[PDB]
Each structure stands twice: as C-alpha cells, then as structure tokens.
C-alpha cells in the first residue's frame, strides 16, 4: 500500500511554537 | 470537558468539527447496512451452491424457481437467466451450438455483472472520506495556530502560559480528523475483500454452468 | 467569461477581507 | 500589536505573505466561478436528453434547434452538427451510406471536443498553486531563520530572548503556505472527477444518437 | 527507560502499543510462513517442466501420474485435468476436435484459477496493517501530547523539566507504528511480483499444451 | 555576508553550491530557449490557417509551399505529406476509394508525430531538478551541523557565539536549493500547457482536411 | 498536483534539533 | 566523523545503517550495469537504422539476416519478424490486402513489445528504494529526538553534553538516508527517458515499414 504520514505536520509545528517561549517561567 | 473546549473554538473551527461528525455518523451507517446485507448474500449463494450439486434434476429447478422467479437473486437469478436462454436459443432462429453457447455466455455475463454492480455501492463514499478526512484536520489546526499568534501579539505579555490555550483546538480538530478518518479505511478494505471473493464464487459457478452444459450439445 | 471571472475576483476579495477582519476583531476578545 | 509585529519582521517575509494571501484570492475565486458554469451544463444537457425522449418529431427538433443555431451549447450543439452533417452529404450522391454514417460521426466528434476543452479552461491554475505554495512559505521560513542567527551571531549583546520574535514571524509563512495550499488541492480533483462524468454522458449519447442515424438508414 | 514509561504512561498509551505489537508479530509469522510456499511452488513447476521435456512418452507419466490421486499441485494437477477432459470428451464426442480442445481449454482455465486463489491466501492482510498502523500511532501522540499541555497550563509557572517525559511517552507510540508500518508494505509489494511469475509460467505451459493438443486432434 | 560564509565552508558544501548554481543558470537558459520557439510556432500556426481559409485555390496554395520545401515547419508541413501522399496514391490507381483515407490518414499521423517530438526537447530535464533539488541542500546542511558539532568540542567552555556562524553557513544550502527548485516547477506546468493546445490544434486540422479529402473523393 | 512532504518534515525536524541542541536548561 | 558517532550510537542505528549501505551498493551495481546495456542497445539500434536506407535491396538484406536465425537484437529483429509474416500472408490470402496488413502491423506489436519487455528490468527496485529509503531515516530521527527528550527529563539543569547522542544519532541517519535516496530516483528518471526515446525510436520505424509495405499492396 501506501504510507501516509500527514498528521504529523501539527506535532512539529506545535512543539517549534513551544520552544520559543518555554525559556520564561 | 469537552463542551467547554466546543464552545470555546472559532466559527470555523464548530463548522469543520460539525461536517467531520456527520461524516462519521454516515460512515458508521453505512458500515452497518452493508454488512449485513453482504453476510446474507454470501449465506444465500453458499447455501444455494450446497443445494445445486444433491442430484436434483434440471428441469424441476428450473419448476422450483418460477415459483419465485419475481425476487430470484444471485446465484439463483444466474441459473435462472442461463436455462432460459438455453431454452429459448434452442427453438428460435438458428439452432448452432455456437450460437447456443454465445447466447448463453452473454446472458450469465450480463446477469452477474448486475448483480455485483447491485451488491457494492456507497463504498466508494467511504474511500472519499478516508481520503479527505486528514487534509480538514491540518486546515483547522493551522487556522488554530494562525488565531493563537494573533491573540497572543493582542496583549503585551509573551508568556508561554498565554500560548498554551491555542494549542487546544488545534490538536483536537486533528484528533478529530483522525478518529473519523481509521473506521472508514478499515471497513474499506474488508468490504473490497468480501466483495472479490463473492465475484470469484461467482465466476466459478458460472464456468461450471457453462462447462456442463457445452458437453450435451 | 472575462465579466464573470472579474465578479467572482471581486467576490472573493471581499469575503477574505471580511474573513480576516472578522478574525482580527474575534482575536482581540 | 499585530501591525508592531508585522512591521518587525523583515520585508521578505511581509512580501511572502502579501503574495500568499493573493494566491488564496484568486484560487477561490476560480473555484467560486467554475461551479455554476458545470452545474448549469449539467441540468442543461439532463433536460435536453429528457425532452429527446418524449417522441417529438426530429424534423421539429432541428427546427428548433436552428432557430438559435448560433446560440447552441452543450448536446444541443453535437446534434445539430451531426444532422447538418447527415444532411449535407446525403445530397451528394453518396452511394454508400456507410460513408454517411462515418461523416456524421466525425463531424460529431470534431464538436465534442470541441465543447469540452470550452468547459476545460482554467483549472491547471489550481495545481500549479497546490505544487507551488508550500515552497515559498518554507523559504521564507529558512531565511528568516538564517538572517535571525546571522544578527545573533554578529553583536555579542544580543540573546534568544530578544530574537524570539522574528522565529514565530518565520513559521507563520510556513503556516499561510499550508492555508493557501490545501483547498485548491483538492478543488482540482473534484472538478477533475466532475468533468469526467460529463465526458461519460456525452459519450453514451453520441454512441445512442449514432446507431438512432445508422438503423433509419 | 523505556520500561519505565511503559509503565508510567496512561492505559490508551499502553493499549496502542499491544495492538501495534500484535500487528507486528501477525505479520512476520504469516510473511515466513508464506515465503516457503511460493518457492517449494516454483521449483516442484520447473522440475515436472524438466520431467515433460525429456522426451517421455505422455502415456506412461499419465500411467504414474494416478498414483497421486487429490495429491497433485501446480503443473501436474493442472495437466491431469487438461488430459483427462481431452481423452474423456474425445472419446465420448468426435463430432469437432475444435470443441474437443475448446473443453479442454475450458477445463484448464478452471483448475488454474482454482490453484493460483489457493496460493494468494493472506496477502491482502498485509495491506491494512501498513495503511492503518500509523494513524494509530499518531492518534496517540495527539492523545498524549493534548493531556500533557493540559496539565502543564494548569500550573502558572512554565518548565519543560516537568513536561519532559510526556512527550517522550508519546512519541514512542509513533515510533512503534511506523516500525510495525514499513517492512508489511515493503514485503506486500514483493510478494505480489512472485504470484505474476508464476501466472506467466502457467501461461506458458498451458499455450504450449493447447498447441500440442491441436495438433494431436486431427490425427 | 553570503561571500564569506560560501568561502568558510568545507570542500563538500562548495561543490553542492556550485553544483545547484549550475543547474539554475542551465534552467534559466532552457526557459528562455524554450519559451522564444514555441511563441514563435504559435505564431505561425495562426497565422497559416488564416490563408488557408482565405479561399485560394489549392494549386496555388500547393506550387507556394513547394517553392520553400527547404522551410517548411510546422502546419504546413503535414498539409505538404498529406496531399503529396494523396497524389501518389491516386496515379497509382483509380480503384478502392477508401484506401486513400486510411493512407492519407498514415501519412499526417507520421509528421504530426515527428514534428511534436521536435517540439518537447530538453523539458523533462526540468522536472528532475525540481525533484532532487531540495534533498541536496538538505544534505549539505545535516553536514555542515555535524562538521561545526564535531569541532564544538575542541573548546571546553560552550558559548553560543562560536556556533552561531556555522548554522547559517549550513543554512545557506536549504536556501539556494529552495531557490533553484521553485522556477522549474513553475515553468514545467506551463510548457506541458503550451504543448497540450498545440497537439490540440494539429488534431483539429487533421480532422478537417481528413473530412474534405472524403468529400472530394466520392462524386 | 500532491503535497510533497518529505522535505518538510527533514527540515522541520533539522529545526528542532538546532533549537534543542542550543538549549543549556 | 563517521566512525566516531557510529561507535556512539545504539544496535538500532547499526542495523539501520547496515541495511542502508546495502541497498546503496545493490543500488550502485545496478546502475552501472544497465546504463552500459542501455548505451549498447541504443549503438546498435542507431546503426541498423543507419544501414536500411543504404539502396541494398530487401532480399539480401533478408538473405543476410537469416545468417544470424533467431539471435537478434535491436530493430534487426523487428524486421525478421514481420517481413516473413507478411510474405506468408499474401502468399496465402491474396484476395484480402487489407489483411495482410493488420495481421503484419499485429506481429511487429507484439514483437515490439516483447523486447521493451526484454529492456526493462529490475528498474522497479530502484522505484522502491527511492520510495522508502526516507522513511527509515525517519525512524531513525524520531528514536533520536525522544532519547534526547529522555535525557532532557531525566536530570534537572542538564549539560550539552548528556545531549549529544540523540542528535548525534538522529543527524546520521537523516543523513545516510538522504545518501541513499538521491541516486535512486535520478537514475530512476534518467533510464525512463531513455527507454522511451528507444520505445519512440521503434514506433517511428514500424511506422515506416507499414506504410512501405501499405504502398506495395495497393497495387
């Protein structure tokens, strides 16, 4: 068949936009 | 819970969350029809093909199934359609044996391709939503990220804990997406299945009928 | 052709600006 | 606000954006325009196929077609042009009328294709975006990124803290890019499904109206 | 390590992970336990082809070939049938020797359809696991990914020390799926392309036996 | 700024650089080659079909185009074989009036073929560079991190300003890669487009002229 | 037609790992 | 470089590159054979297109070719097969013209298509390494991120140094993946093109041939 991973575009951009402000408390 | 978190979304986001459960519920419906209408016509031609080889003559078939000739299905419709092709080809117009196993061919044929054409339908729904569903997800988590950064440049503050309420919708349209999306394809697939194996039972009653009766002629 | 392809460019510029507009507006909420 | 973090952000980036936001206009803007004109050909061509059905004279039909001969779309235009066809050549003398039968049927098939690539028009716009625009959006990604270590890089004094800005202001082209990709994604295979199904149509009439000709000659 | 958020991890975590694992082992057994049948196919095939063309009168290998009465496969079943009809029909009806290798034909195309749906069984198990496995896998890093910044917003201060191990716990789940994913589809693709051979060399032979019986049909 | 860092980088990134800088300026002369000849044939195209139902007779038309056999291309070339093949067959012989059409027909085919072949030369170059272009850049990135990793560790104290140029000098290749592959993605689409209504318009006049070659055949 | 996605998810992922490696917490 | 961080990874990543590296080389021999057998194929194909126009008549032409028998190659063996053909069908069936050309047009078909058969090979394993190489570095990637994550979580105000193996780890095999990908698919495309260059080739002369053989016919 075929192997479909597009959900995971959501996963990376969710984590990136966490990373930016996770240094402040 | 989870009616906080549907009340608290955009216009757009109750609109994609409202389209993606009806799209589950007519999956989930249409699942349920078709299976048990396939389980019954594949019960039916079993039992029927059990009955055919017993040592029952050809001719008080042919006396049983006008009896209900009027809702005659599958297999039954087949050996129907054949014997009385047969039948009218060896009497009318030109009485060749190939023109008698021509005629018969073409009616089998054509019998069986309607019935399988009758057997699977709204699948092809099915395929559409298993193929579609994701792609809704990802546009209602990006809109969710586009809302979220525009919010948080609205106040001064750049706290992670001010982003942290955007985050919400955008994963749940994708697990939303998601939950419609694998019912779908799986169902897909073990219907496609039920259905060859149904046409290969089929097309070999149908060799078997055609086989049998280009030996007296 | 042209004149209904300029109509549905008009249309469609206004729908997206009031989309984004009404997105702007519900974000400061 | 939003305007103070527009205005931070590099002009490529802004520049990026501006052109996405255009992209989305006029691909839904086609979308918009293409869906009335199949609709309407297709509620046009199921009431002429209806009302060729009710037994009225072919004579009357061609009359009635010729009364708006330049004002002819759909199957209405295939008809005309195969019985002019039909007509015309069967004046000359033809003494086969195989010949007649083969002239109708190309000049029906010059029509059809003509018609249709008239529907055709204006839909590999939508596939060229779809290939197109994430593209863009992960370049302009990649060099805000580039350009924002190449600042931290170059004074001492600076820290992430203060770059944090222009990070999100990357992701939000990659986020547009995705926004402005998938509708016109999947636009293009409906409409492309759409069009075949008038194809079929058209097909099954011309092989119908072909044989009609072939048995009254 | 693993273990230990194996154990920490919520049940639906857990629960995707059995089903992942039970797919996985599903599919290995049963691609072992295919792989041996199509290659004891393939060389039983070319040894009664060598055995054919060696020049042995049909008779006598007709002679040996009852004694392996509901015993016969590939080649051999299938000329047993062939052979059978022929000789059956024939001398029965010798009114055409057209319809003689017609029913022969027929016979032919029967028992080879009936023998190559007998060696496809189970290959098209192989397809699910590969397009589904990996939707489950994500399912469960959304799940997860969903709760742990849940729990995190609901403390005012911000530390990615406390919420460390929650993604980690959910990208095991994508980890696992997309392991038990690839190798179902890449061995669903390569088994499909050995059942092609065997329908060419089927092919084949049964041209060649139709051409050998026209001949013989008119002496 | 983009100088130095391209002179800081190692041996592998100026070869992918160069690599990438080779392929755009080989796309951007294609395009520009490409686009000049295929207006230039839409030209002609139009423009002969405006004579050709003017309503000259076709002896003139004929004695014009054979006094520049040595530039013909385009539409009036398969109007050339078209009508040469139809002549020869008619002095041949007189007899079985459908064979000129069947003949006819062959004779268009060939150079409708051949002239559309000459057409479409050197694009499928374009759709490889916008296939494998971004994967190089990707290359020449992961390696540029590892190179400026590897090296971090020489140093015991860690400052982010040692690495801050590094990961641009890797960054550069993504860049240039993204760069170079958008226009041959652009411009492949249109091409194809471009070729599609031309092939559209030939099979538009060899239905015409097919229709009046059997008008004019049977009286 | 088609969204690639490959070369997203290699560099998103290339991304993250620059943004944790830069990480000291 | 390599060998360094290869010590510092794990028995997954060692597996991983293993199997990589093997489908590189398989890759690579591959390549090498059959772009030689493809240069080859098209020489020859070159030069008997080159001696068919040299004003020899066809019965020596025939005669000389019969020196070979069956062992042809190239368009020398669409000749043979289709020549005879159309000599033994209009010795035959003289009264049919319009015969002996469908069934000669029949025979160079399928002749044609047994040798682009022939030319094609082990082409769809490149088409399958290309397709799934990326994947496996994902894997890889994946397995690499959440070990970090798990060091991250593991010691409160952690070093870059106890971080260094997940993305030592998920860099190589990124990279190795990539490494593997790329050849796949230019060669992939590259041969495509060639081969439908020769598929081209090959209809343009059946082509010809017909309509020579057309034109004989009609009288």
């Known amino acids: 068949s075929e192997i479909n991973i597009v959900p995971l575009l959501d996963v990376l951009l969710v984590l990136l936009l966490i990373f930016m402000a996770t240094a402040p408390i | ?217 | 052709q042209n004149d209904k392809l300029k109509r549905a460019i008009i249309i469609s510029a206004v729908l997206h600006v009031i989309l984004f507009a009404a997105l702007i507006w519900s974000s400061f909420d």
């Open chain 2, 1 to 217: 819970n989870i009616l906080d978190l549907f009340l608290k979304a955009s216009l757009l986001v109750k609109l994609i969350m409202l389209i993606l459960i009806g799209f589950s519920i007519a999956s989930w419906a249409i699942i349920i029809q078709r299976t048990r209408i396939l389980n019954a016509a594949a019960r039916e031609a079993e039992a029927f093909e059990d009955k055919f080889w017993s040592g029952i003559e050809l001719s008080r078939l042919y006396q049983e199934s006008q009896g209900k000739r009027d809702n005659l299905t599958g297999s039954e419709q087949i050996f129907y359609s054949g014997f009385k092709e047969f039948v009218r080809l060896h009497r009318a117009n030109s009485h060749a044996p190939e023109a008698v196993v021509e005629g018969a061919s073409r009616a089998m044929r054509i019998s069986m391709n309607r019935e399988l054409e009758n057997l699977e339908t709204h699948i092809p729904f099915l395929g559409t939503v298993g193929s579609i569903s994701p792609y809704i997800g990802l546009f209602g988590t990006v809109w969710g990220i586009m809302h979220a950064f525009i919010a948080l440049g609205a106040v001064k503050q750049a706290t992670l804990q001010m982003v942290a309420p955007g985050i919400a919708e955008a994963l749940i349209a994708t697990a939303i997406g998601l939950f419609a999306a694998i019912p779908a394809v799986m169902a897909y697939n073990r219907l496609n299945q039920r259905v060859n194996k149904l046409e290969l039972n089929y097309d070999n009653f149908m060799e078997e009928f055609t086989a049998i009766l280009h030996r007296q002629a």
